[PDB]
Amino acid sequence: PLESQYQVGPLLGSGGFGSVYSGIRVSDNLPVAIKHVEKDRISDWGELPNGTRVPMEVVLLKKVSSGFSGVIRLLDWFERPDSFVLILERPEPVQDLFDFITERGALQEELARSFFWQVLEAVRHCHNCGVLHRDIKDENILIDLNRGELKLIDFGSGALLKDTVYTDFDGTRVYSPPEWIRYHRYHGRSAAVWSLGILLYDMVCGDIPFEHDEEIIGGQVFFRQRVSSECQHLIRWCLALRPSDRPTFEEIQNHPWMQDVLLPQETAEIHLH
């Protein structure tokens, strides 16, 4: 019983997150985000241990719901005749990273480093749980402005992580790698690293580097803002045209630009409060 277990409030973000409504868990006044997905619009389906057929999004959210705070936590879900309803945590106060970068401009590298590090830890958590997000971008990242903690959201384009080739893709094209543009094929981890290079450029330059397919595959990265040589090198390495030339997550986090990261609380106190 959903309408009894949750007080349902108004639409969140005027539909920009999808059909997501503000909610309160009546059990303990916990704030929640109530996300509705139409069965007729569901791309991939998965099975649960109970054999129940559910959207893949629910399968992936359950697999990463270990309580590690860098990904959105699925608290519960319901099936309806024509839809599924997902009960997600609702941290407050938050701003998504797209709006944050729009309002602040290019981020100071100390702040970009803290944010990027936390995204890397969150993506590592996903992969360790068998989950490939496939839509890493600033729009899909929430900033907890009080705690200085980032949360990866919207697993609706994701997949179970596999080591074999992917031939389908439903994430954001301007964050997708050149092997997808050219061949409609990619491997999960190196495609993720490409999207992280796009995200890092986005943070330190104030917008993403590429808008057109020709720029994605062209292999030239022009820096529109002052960016340190070490950060430029990491970005260009993540944006290597050939997937095997890109760094692993270990190589990214061992990169010189990534050292001496701020703690989440330090990040909030220096940059967000």
Partner: peptide, 9 residues
């Protein structure tokens, strides 16, 4: 001056 936009999935 340059236009920054969201990109749907």
């Amino acid at each position: 001056a340059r236009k920054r936009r969201r990109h749907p999935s």
